[PDB]
C-alpha cells in the first residue's frame, strides 16, 4: 500500500520532498521535453 | 596609476563612515522597535555617537594578554578587517563606477568569503582561552557550512548570466530582475548571508548568556574594534550582493523615462539600505538557534535546496534554449 | 544581439587594422635585418635572416615572454 | 513622526555608498579624459595602443 | 599536439605536429621525418631561434 | 615502423572530424565563414 | 558532439544496420536474448534471497539482487542484439528480415 | 587581460596601511571532536563541486546536452555520497 | 549516441551495481526494524554476483569493446591485451571476494563498505588497464591507491592496521607525487600526453647525443613510481609492513590484483614507447636487488605473512627480468609468470585465511599439521614446492625462463644470482614442510576446518599447480597473443 | 628568461617538499604537508607548461590533480586521526611496532 | 624582478613550513606559499586557477589541516629534534637535485638574452584572434564536460571514495 508512505514522507520531510520535486523537474525537462521539441522542429 | 590611491581612499573612507553609522542605525532601529530612543545625547539625534565610541576605543589601553602567540593574536583582527575591506574593489555602484572590472569577479568574491574564516579561528587559538577556542571552532564550522549554499546560489545566478563579471550580472537583469523568478533562491541567499555573517538568528558570538563564549572575548581596544568593523562591513557587502544578484543592481524598477531620471547609484543605495534594514528587523524579531540546530539547517535544508535549484534552472534553460 | 553587433563591427574594420600592422611589421623587420647585417659583419658563414624552420613557413619572431598578451 | 530620527543614519549610509561610487567615477574620468569602459578586452587594449601611435605620429 | 589553444583557437604548434604525424604515418624509417620533427620541437621551445639571437648579442657585445 | 600501423594513427583520422569545433580553429576561418 | 561508431576490428558478418537505434535494438531481441535476460535476472534474485536470510532481509535483498540482475540481463541482451545488427556476431536471422523486408 | 588586478593590489596595500595605523595608534597614549574534521571533509567535497560548476555554468551554451548530462552524472555520484553521509549521521550534531 | 557506450558496458554496469550495493547496505544497516543487521556477507555475495556479471559482459562482447575507437581514443584504448588483462583482473577479484565470508562471519567484520571499496578499486584497475594517456593513467592509479589506503586501515581500533594505513598513505603519496612530476616533465618536453603521440615523438632517437634531459628525467621519475607500485627494491619497504598489518583479506587482494593492473600499465607505457636501454637497465638492476633482498629477508622471517610478502618481492624480481630483456618471449614469460604467481598466491592465501580462524601467526604454529589435518598439510606443501620452483609443478616455469633469458641475453652474473636465490628460496620454503611434517612439538594447535568456498578454490588451484604442465598450451598461446597485440 | 624562472619557482617548492621529508623524522604531520608541497609544485609545472606550449591539456590535468590532492589530504588526515586516537600520541616511537 | 620577489617569498615561507617548531604555524606558512603561488598564476594570465587555488587549497584543504592540527594540541617534545646533523645529507641531496633539476630546461629551452635594442617592436599583432576573446574559464569549460568527460567522472569517483573512507574510519555515532 505505497500511497500514504509518500504522504507521510512529504509531511515529515517537506524540504527533502521539495528538493526532489525541483530537481526532478530540472531533470525531466531535458530528458523528455527537449527531444520532443527537437523532433517537432525537424518535421 | 598615480590617481588609483585617490579612488581607493574614496572607496575606503566612506565605507568606514558607513559602517560607523550602520552601528548607530541598528541601535536606533532596535530602540524604536522597543519603544525607546537609542543614542540621542552625544550629538544631535546621537549623530556623534560613532565618533565618540571610536575615539574611546582608540584611547583605551590594549591588554594583549600574556599568551605565547602575541603576533597571531594581533594579526587576526587585521586579517579579517583587510578581507572585509578588499571585497569592495570589484563592487559596481553604477555603470562604470567600479574600481576593478574583474572578469572573474564572482569567483573572487567566493574566494574572499572562503578566506574570512581564518581571522576567527586564529583569534580563538591565539587567545589562550578554551572558551574562546570552542566558540571560534563553532563559528568557523558554521561559516564554512553556509559557504556551500552561498556558492551553489552563485552558480544559479551564473547559469542565468553566463559570465562572472558583476557589471554583466547587473546588465543581464535589464529585461527582468532575477529576484522575481528566483524569489525562493533570494530568500535562501539572504538567510545564508545572515548565517555567514554570524548574525541573528545565527549570532553564536553574541550568545554569551547562553554559556557560549565568543571568539573575541579576550580582545580589547582596537583589535575588538577591527573585528566589529569587519563584521559590519561584511553585512553591508552582503546587502550589496543581494542587491546586485537579484534586485537589478543600479537598474530602475521599471524601464521608463520617469524612473531613469534619478541616478543608478541612488537606486543601488536604496536597495542596499532595504536589506540592511532587514538585517536589523530580523535581529529585533526572533530568538536564536542552537549550534546543532543551525548546523542541521545548513547541511539538511539549504544545501539540498540550493543543489535542486541549480539543477532546475540549468535544465529549464538548456531545454528551451534560453541560455545566454 | 548587442554583442553580435559589436563583433560584426569588429569584423568589418579588421582588414585595415591588419594591413597597417603588416606594413609596420615589415618595415620594422627590414630595420632589424639591416641591423643584423651590420652587426654580424665579419662573421664567417652567417646568413642574415635565416629561417630556423626547415619547412620554411613564416612565423612571428619569438619574444621570450610567457604571457605578454595579458598585460 | 519621531521615527525620522532612525532614517538619518540610514540616509547617511546611503550617501556614503553614493560617494563610494561617484568619487571613484569622476577621478577616473578626469585622469583618463573619458569614463571607465566596462568590458575592456584584448581588442580594446590593442585599439588604445594603436590609436596612441595613430594620434601622436600624425 | 592536442590542438586546443589556451585562448580558444588552434594551438600554436599544432600544424607542425600534424605534419610530423602525417609524415610518420607512412615513412618506415623515422629518419625520414627528422626535419618536420625538429620543426615541431623548434615551435615548442624556440631553441634555435634564441640560440642564433644570442649569437648576435654575443658578437655585438664583443665588438663594443 | 609500428607507428605506421592503422591502430597507431587514431588522431590522424579523428582530429579532422573536429577541425571546425570552436576552441581549436584557425582564427581566419571565423572571418570567412 | 561529433560521434563516430567506426570500430577498430571490422565486422565479420553482413552489416544489417551500422548504428541501430535503441528502440530498434530492443525490438530485435530474440528468444535467446529473452532467455539470457531471464536466466541472469532469476539467478540474481536467487542469490539475493539466499544471501539475505542470515541478516533477516531476504525480501529487500531479493529486490536488490533482482535490480542488479535486471540491469545486467538487459545489458547483455542489448549487447547481443546490437552486435548482431552491426554484424559483429553471427546474425543469419537479422539478414533474413533484411533481405525479405 | 589581467590589467584590472593591479588596483586590487594597491587596494590591499592601502587597507593594510589603514589596519596598521588603527591597531598601532593605541600603543602611543586537549579534546578532539571528530565532527569538526567531518564538517571539513564535507565542505571540501562541496567546495570542489562549486569549483567544477563555474566552468560548466559559463559554458552551458556550447556543451549543450552532452555537457549537461555529464555534469548530471558527476552530481549523481557525489549525491550518492551525500546520501551515504546523511544516513550515517554525519549531518547530525546532536 | 547510445551505441558508442557499448565500449564501456562492463564499467557502466559494475559502477552502477556498486552504487546499488552502497545504497542497499546503508539503508538496511541503519534500520532499527531489522536490528541493524551485519551486511558484509550479503553485500559480498551480491558483489561477487556483480563481478561475475561484469566478467560475462566483458568476455562475451569482445569485438564490441573496440567500437567507436576514434570517439573514445583520447580517453582510453581497448584491444586484445586489455581484454585478457581485464578478464584476469575480474577473476582475481572474484576469487579474493569468495575467500572473505568466513572472515566476515567469525571475526565479525560487519562493514559492508569494505566490499564497496574493493569494487571501486576494481573499477579503478579496469580503467588502469585501458589507460592510454598519462592523465588517465594517473587518475586510475590514484583511485586504486585511495581505495587501498582506506581498506588497509579498516580495523580502525587495531595498532597494526592503523600503522599499516599510515605508512601506506605517506609512502604512496610520496611515490605518486614523484610519478606526477615525471608526467609533468614529459608533457613540458614533448607537448603531449597521449601514448601514441609519445610513441611517435620518442621513436628513432633515444639518446642521440642531443638528448632531451626533460624526457630522460620524466621517464626516470615515472619508472620510480611504477617500481614502488610493483614492490621492487629499493622502493619496496612499505610492502612487508603493509601486508602484515592489513587484515588478511586485504593482504590477499593487494598481493594479486594491483600487480596485473600496473604491469599492464608498464607494458603499454614503455614497450609501446621508445627510449634507450636505460629503462631496461633500471628494471634489470631492480630485479637483481629484488631477488637478493627478497631471498635473504624471507630467510630471516618467522611469521607466515611476512614470509609471503618477501617471497612476492623476490618473484616480482624474477618477473621483471622478463621485461628487461625486451623480446616478445620476454613479455610472454612475464605474463605467464604473473598468471602462475597469481594462482599460487591465491592458493597460499586461501590456506592462510583458513588457518586464521585459529589465529595462525607464526610458522611454528603449523607444527603437527600433517597429523591434525593430513590433506591440508599436503596441499600447503604442494604450494610451497611450487613456490620453490621444483618441477613438474607450475612454479617451475618462472625459474626456467629466468635462466633461459639470462643464457640468451648473454648474462652470467644474473644466472649466478638466480642459482643462489633459488637455493635460498628452496630452503626457506621447505622449512614450512619440515615444520608441518618433521617436528614433534610439545604443544599442538588444532585448526578449525575451512568453509566450502576456500576448499573448492583450494582444490581447483592445487589441481592446476600439480597438473598445468601436462596441458599448458592455452596459457602459452593466449600470452603469445597478448604480447603481439601490444605492437601490432 | 621567463620560463626558467617559473620553473625554478616550482623547483624550489618541490625541493622544499623533499627537504621536509628529510628533516622531519619525528614529525609525520609535516611529512604529509611536505608531500602536499610536492603536489602543488607539479600542479604549477602543468599550468606553466600549458601556457608555454599554448596547449590546454596542462590545465585539464591541473584541475583533476587538485581533486586528487583534496581527496588524498582528506583520507590522510583521517588515518592520522585514527592513529592518534588508538595511541593517544603522534610520536613516531608508537607507530613502529611492525618491523623486520 | 617580480618573479624574484615571489620566488624569495615562497622560498622563505616553504622553509618555514618545513622548519617551524609549532605545526599550526607550519599550516599558516603553507597558506602563505599558496597565496604566493596564486600571485604567480595571476602573472601567467590564468585567473581562474589563481582564484581556485585560494578557494580550494586555502579555503578548504588548509582549513582541514588547521582544524585537525589545532585539536591535536601537540606538545613540542613528541615532534622535536635537532636538525643540525642533517646539514651534510641535505646538502648533498639538495646540491645534486639543484644542479640536475634547476637547469633541466636550459638545454631544451635556451633563454633569450635581453639585448640593448628594442626587440619589442618586432611584436607582430594578429587581430583575428582578438575579435571574440575567451576567458581561461570558458576555455577550460569547453573541454572538461564533453571531450574529456571520462576523466571528470573518474575524479568524481575519487571524491566519493574520500567521503566513504572519512566516514568508515572516523565515525562514532552518538
Ligand atoms: C554595542 O555595540 C557596539 C560596538 O561594539 C560592541 C562598537 O564598537 C561601536 C562603535 C565603534 C566605532 C564607531 C568604530 C569606528 C571607527 C571608524 C569609523 C574608523 C576610524 C574613525 C575614527 C573617527 C578614528 C580616527 C583615528 C585616527 C587615528 C585618525 C586618523 C585619520 C558601537 C556604536 C556599538 O553600538
Author numbering:
A (entry chain b): 2 to 44
B (entry chain H): 2 to 325
C (entry chain Z): 73 to 143
D (entry chain a): 3 to 60
E (entry chain e): 2 to 65
F (entry chain i): 52 to 84
G (entry chain f): 1 to 101
H (entry chain A): 1 to 29, 55 to 119
Task: Provide the authors' original text about this structure.
Protein complexes of the mitochondrial respiratory chain assemble into respiratory supercomplexes. Here we present the high-resolution electron cryo-microscopy structure of the Arabidopsis respiratory supercomplex consisting of complex I and a complex III dimer, with a total of 68 protein subunits and numerous bound cofactors. A complex I-ferredoxin, subunit B14.7 and P9, a newly defined subunit of plant complex I, mediate supercomplex formation.
In the two slightly different conformations of the supercomplex, the angular range is 6–10°. This indicates a slightly flexible arrangement of the two subcomplexes and raises the question whether the supercomplex actively induces membrane curvature or whether it adapts to a locally non-planar lipid bilayer. As seen from the matrix side, the consensus refinement structure as well as the two resolved I + III2 supercomplex conformations include an angle of 65–67° between the complex III dimer and the membrane arm of complex I. The two conformations of the supercomplex-bound form of complex I we describe in our present study are very similar and both correspond to the closed state with respect to the inter-arm angle. This angle ranges from 106° to 108° in the two conformations, and the C1-FDX subunit is present and well defined in both. The π-bulge is identical in both our slightly different I + III2 supercomplex conformations, presumably due to the substrate-depleted conditions during sample preparation.
